[PDB]
């Protein structure tokens, strides 16, 4: 299926053309010629955060009780 | 600065240095020395030159069950989209290998025949 | 084969790529026909400054 903002074909698994950059009702593959999905996919979205390293402060050391 | 250095040896105790640089772009560059000269190869060229495959196998090989870590997920997304956007005309192993044989013909000195 | 070396170059480096690109800006044709006849006139000025070569056969 779709994994985050990454989706591949259910048979060949090749990288596909961006569904938010196509004009038709489907997605054409770069190597084979198959239609997946019917463009009624759950929309392309991710959830990302920071890593608790790039933000230094003495206030952060105050949280080290 | 992030780099995997490795020293690939042969069974005659010779060796060859292979360096992997992380880029700030989304590609991973490869250093290898040859005859007091080096080169720079994008690593997905090497990946699809070893064996014909799909990108899902690359996903299953690198990150595995760590799919919630969206950091490396977006890094691999950069890598795959940049590879198949920069040269989409390469779609098997044979095209890429003959691309390599054209790019690396006049230095390995096997040019009039092979 | 120099163009094949440049084809390996443009993928190969960033320091030898810049070095041989400077060498290609250095390589380019340093003689045209109008420049050829102008330099023929300058070799006539070399005739004017012809500090003559020794005869290298009898001396
Ligand atoms: Zn497909």
Curated annotation (Swiss-Prot), chain A:
Changing residue 9 to S: Severe growth defect. A zinc finger (C4-type) spans 9-32. Keywords: DNA-directed RNA polymerase, Metal-binding, Nucleus, Ribosome biogenesis, Transcription, Zinc, Zinc-finger. One of its GO terms (cellular component) is nucleus. Residues 1-65 are annotated as: Necessary and sufficient for recruitment into Pol I. The keyword Zinc applies. Residues 1-59 are annotated as: Interaction with RPA2. It comes from the Eukaryota. It is found in: Nucleus, Nucleolus. One of its GO terms (biological process) is ribosome biogenesis. Zn(2+) 1 binds at residues 9, 12, 29, 32. One of its GO terms (molecular function) is zinc ion binding. Its main location: nucleus. The keyword Zinc-finger applies. Component of the RNA polymerase I (Pol I) complex consisting of 14 subunits: RPA135, RPA190, RPC40, RPA14, RPB5, RPO26, RPA43, RPB8, RPA12, RPB10, RPC19, RPC10, RPA49 and RPA34. The complex is composed of a horseshoe-shaped core containing ten subunits (RPA135, RPA190, RPB5, RPO26, RPB8, RPB10, RPC10, RPA12, RPC19 and RPC40) where RPA135 and RPA190 form the DNA-binding cleft. Outside of the core, RPA14 and RPA43 form the stalk that mediates interactions with transcription initiation factors and newly synthesized RNA. Interacts with RPA2/RPA135. Present with 8450 molecules/cell in log phase SD medium. DNA-dependent RNA polymerases catalyze the transcription of DNA into RNA using the four ribonucleoside triphosphates as substrates. Component of RNA polymerase I (Pol I) which synthesizes ribosomal RNA precursors. Besides, RNA polymerase I has intrinsic RNA cleavage activity. Proposed to contribute to the polymerase catalytic activity and form the polymerase active center together with the two largest subunits. Subunit RPA12 contributes a catalytic zinc ribbon that is required for RNA cleavage by Pol I. Involved in transcriptional termination. Belongs to the archaeal RpoM/eukaryotic RPA12/RPB9/RPC11 RNA polymerase family. This is DNA-directed RNA polymerase I subunit RPA12. It comes from Saccharomyces cerevisiae (strain ATCC 204508 / S288c) (Baker's yeast). The lineage of its organism: Eukaryota, Fungi, Dikarya, Ascomycota, Saccharomycotina.
UniProtKB/Swiss-Prot annotation, chain B:
DNA-dependent RNA polymerases catalyze the transcription of DNA into RNA using the four ribonucleoside triphosphates as substrates. Component of RNA polymerase I (Pol I) which synthesizes ribosomal RNA precursors. Besides, RNA polymerase I has intrinsic RNA cleavage activity. RPA190 and RPA135 both contribute to the polymerase catalytic activity and together form the Pol I active center. In addition, subunit RPA12 contributes a catalytic zinc ribbon that is required for RNA cleavage by Pol I. It is found in: Nucleus, Nucleolus. Component of the RNA polymerase I (Pol I) complex consisting of 14 subunits: RPA135, RPA190, RPC40, RPA14, RPB5, RPO26, RPA43, RPB8, RPA12, RPB10, RPC19, RPC10, RPA49 and RPA34. The complex is composed of a horseshoe-shaped core containing ten subunits (RPA135, RPA190, RPB5, RPO26, RPB8, RPB10, RPC10, RPA12, RPC19 and RPC40) where RPA135 and RPA190 form the DNA-binding cleft. Outside of the core, RPA14 and RPA43 form the stalk that mediates interactions with transcription initiation factors and newly synthesized RNA. This is DNA-directed RNA polymerase I subunit RPA135. Three distinct zinc-containing RNA polymerases are found in eukaryotic nuclei: polymerase I for the ribosomal RNA precursor, polymerase II for the mRNA precursor, and polymerase III for 5S and tRNA genes. Present with 14100 molecules/cell in log phase SD medium. Coiled coil: none annotated. It comes from Saccharomyces cerevisiae (strain ATCC 204508 / S288c) (Baker's yeast). Belongs to the RNA polymerase beta chain family.
Swiss-Prot record, chain C:
It is found in: Nucleus, Nucleolus. The modification Phosphoserine is found at residue 32. Component of the RNA polymerase I (Pol I) complex consisting of 14 subunits: RPA135, RPA190, RPC40, RPA14, RPB5, RPO26, RPA43, RPB8, RPA12, RPB10, RPC19, RPC10, RPA49 and RPA34. The complex is composed of a horseshoe-shaped core containing ten subunits (RPA135, RPA190, RPB5, RPO26, RPB8, RPB10, RPC10, RPA12, RPC19 and RPC40) where RPA135 and RPA190 form the DNA-binding cleft. Outside of the core, RPA14 and RPA43 form the stalk that mediates interactions with transcription initiation factors and newly synthesized RNA. DNA-dependent RNA polymerases catalyze the transcription of DNA into RNA using the four ribonucleoside triphosphates as substrates. Component of RNA polymerase I (Pol I) which synthesizes ribosomal RNA precursors. Besides, RNA polymerase I has intrinsic RNA cleavage activity. The heterodimer formed by RPA34 and RPA49 stimulates transcript elongation by Pol I. Subunit RPA49 can bind both single-stranded and double-stranded DNA. Belongs to the eukaryotic RPA49/POLR1E RNA polymerase subunit family. This is DNA-directed RNA polymerase I subunit RPA49. It comes from Saccharomyces cerevisiae (strain ATCC 204508 / S288c). The gene is RPA49. The chain holds residues 120 to 178 of 415 of the full protein.
């Amino acid at each position: 299926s779709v994994v985050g903002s990454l989706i591949f074909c259910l048979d060949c698994g090749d990288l596909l053309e961006n569904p938010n950059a196509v004009l038709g009702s489907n997605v054409e593959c770069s190597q084979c010629k198959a239609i997946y999905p019917k463009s009624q996919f759950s929309n392309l979205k991710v959830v990302t955060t920071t890593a608790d390293d790039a933000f230094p402060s003495s206030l952060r050391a105050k949280k080290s009780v | 600065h992030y780099g995997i250095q490795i020293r690939s040896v042969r069974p005659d105790q010779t060796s060859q240095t292979n360096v992997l640089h992380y880029l700030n772009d989304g590609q991973v560059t490869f250093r290898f020395s040859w005859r007091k000269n080096e080169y720079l190869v994008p690593v997905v060229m090497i990946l699809k030159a070893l064996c014909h495959t799909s990108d899902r196998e690359i996903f299953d090989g690198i990150i595995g069950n760590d799919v919630k870590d969206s950091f490396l997920t977006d890094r691999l997304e950069l890598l795959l989209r940049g590879f198949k956007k920069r040269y989409p005309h390469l779609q098997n192993r044979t095209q890429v290998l003959q691309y390599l044989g054209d790019k690396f013909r006049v230095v390995f000195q096997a040019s009039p025949d092979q | 084969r120099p163009s094949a070396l440049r084809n390996a170059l443009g993928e190969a480096f960033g320091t030898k790529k810049a070095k041989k690109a400077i060498a290609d800006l250095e390589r380019n044709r340093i003689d045209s026909d109008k420049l050829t006849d102008s330099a023929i006139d300058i070799v006539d000025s070399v005739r004017t400054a012809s500090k003559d070569l020794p005869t290298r056969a009898q001396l």
